Symmetry: C2
Subunit: 103 residues, 2 copies
């Protein structure tokens, strides 16, 4: 059972959640993949590094790809909170990712 | 295998296709459900009537819900073609539908 993006907050840290949406922004810096996932409610940040089983799939993501993602909620890094997002204090550590469109 | 929404064309008439996207517009008229499904490639029309197994699920659709749909491609009926859309000569008769968000 999924959450809408903005139903996830600092209250959910430690929980495993499922979200479904589309890629608003994909970013890759220092080997770490950051995906802003958009759904009807708004945005949540997915984070994936090479130790995750989802990483290879995460690397194929492009803007507007349809994604169904599962992972654990955690706080964003020190000084990395985004005050303009409802979910801006947290991110989802990506454990599983399905790209519903082709590759 | 999915097609991107606007990869579906006249050459696909009669074939079964799978598409994934979000609801751009939901319309219900005369008991028939019309969904403009949007993905990275653009829009395609899904059509669903009460004789479809996917009808009860289709009734739950709202704008911006993430959908994964399967159905048969056909020509839009005479006079119903929409030349303002790439896929405007065709539509998908909905046979199966999954709503990936909570509905």
């Amino acid at each position: 059972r999924s959450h809408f993006c903005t139903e996830i907050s600092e209250k959910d840290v430690g929980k495993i959640v499922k979200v479904a949406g589309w890629c608003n922004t994909y970013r890759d810096h220092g080997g770490v993949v950051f995906i802003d996932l958009r759904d009807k409610s708004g945005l949540v940040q997915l984070v994936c590094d090479p130790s995750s089983k989802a990483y290879e799939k995460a690397l194929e993501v492009r803007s507007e790809f349809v994604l169904v993602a599962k992972g654990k909620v955690r706080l964003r890094g020190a000084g990395l909170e985004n005050p303009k997002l409802k979910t801006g204090k947290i991110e989802i550590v990506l454990e599983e990712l399905i790209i519903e469109n082709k590759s």
